[PDB]
Amino acid sequence: AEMQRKREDLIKLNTEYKLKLKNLEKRLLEELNNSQGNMLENDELMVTLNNLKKEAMNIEKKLSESEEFFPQFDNLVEE
Amino acid sequence: LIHFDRNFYQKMKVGVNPRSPGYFIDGLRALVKLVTAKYQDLQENQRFVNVGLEKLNESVKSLTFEKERWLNTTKQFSKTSQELIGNCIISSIYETYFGHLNERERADMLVILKRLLGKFAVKYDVNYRFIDYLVTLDEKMKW
């Protein structure tokens, strides 16, 4: 039950976080062009980009366990 | 593609060689339309990380040099582009030859295709999925 539950979120958070990676890159560049001569407002998005240090590396966390999950999935298809 | 079409009729179709090349032409026409669609979009995202490389260098501060160290993504692009030619091969074949095949009949041809991709000096994504590769989450929702 543990691996069929994680199978759904594996390709879900694969696409979700990569769409959030494309979504947060856009939110960052919009305020960097608005606030460049202004104060460090970008900082108010950079604490969200500090949260992104979990998100960018969340991807890397899940890709690492994928290379471990997939060959176990394919072992279970045979029975 | 020749070795695939020759294998498609050989495995799938029953009735001895009444019928001949159709899909082959359309399979080729799909690849051309797919590689041009993908190389225009590979270079579009490569242009989005090159325009972000220009913008981070202008600024430089404590954590921002981790973002600069995003040559892992820039390094990653070469591996992504290496496989797009052979990835488009499988995608084109799925659109053309697979539409009317069984669950099992699709998978099995994929094997013969992938091992044909294995003999040739063509690089493909080993962890590959037709849905995720050509379906967009906005369309996947819509359907």
Question: What token pair was written down for B141?
Answer: 């929702």
User: Measured between alpha carbons, how far is residue B64 from residues A17, A26, A33, A60 in Å?
Assistant: 20, 16, 16, 19
| CA diameter of chain B | 71
Distance from CA of A3 to the nearest CA of B (A): 18
Q: Count the Cβ atoms, other than its own, within 10 Å of residue B76.
A: 12
DSSP B69: T
Is residue B4 within 8 A of residue B93, CB to CB? The reply is yes
Nearest to B63 among A50, A66, A70 (CB): A50
A25 touches chain B (CB under 8 A): yes
Contact yes or no for B127 and A70 at CB 8 A: yes
Interface test with A, best of B45, B48, B65 (most A CBs within 10 A): B48
Contact yes or no for A11 and B132 at CB 8 A: yes
Distance from CA of A49 to the nearest CA of B (A): 10
Distance from CA of B15 to the nearest CA of A (A): 32
Measured over the CA atoms of residue A44, residue A13, residue B131 and residue B5, the dihedral's sign is positive
Resolution of the model in angstroms? 3.3
| CA–CA dist A19, B123 (Å, integer) | 26
Within 8 A by CB and 6+ apart from B63, the residues are: A46, A49, A50, A53
Broken C–N links (> 2.5 Å) in chain B, after residues: 60
**Coarse DSSP helix, strand, coil percentages of chain B, rounded to the nearest 5 percent:** 75, 0, 25
Residue ranges of the alpha helices (H) in chain A?
2-34, 42-76
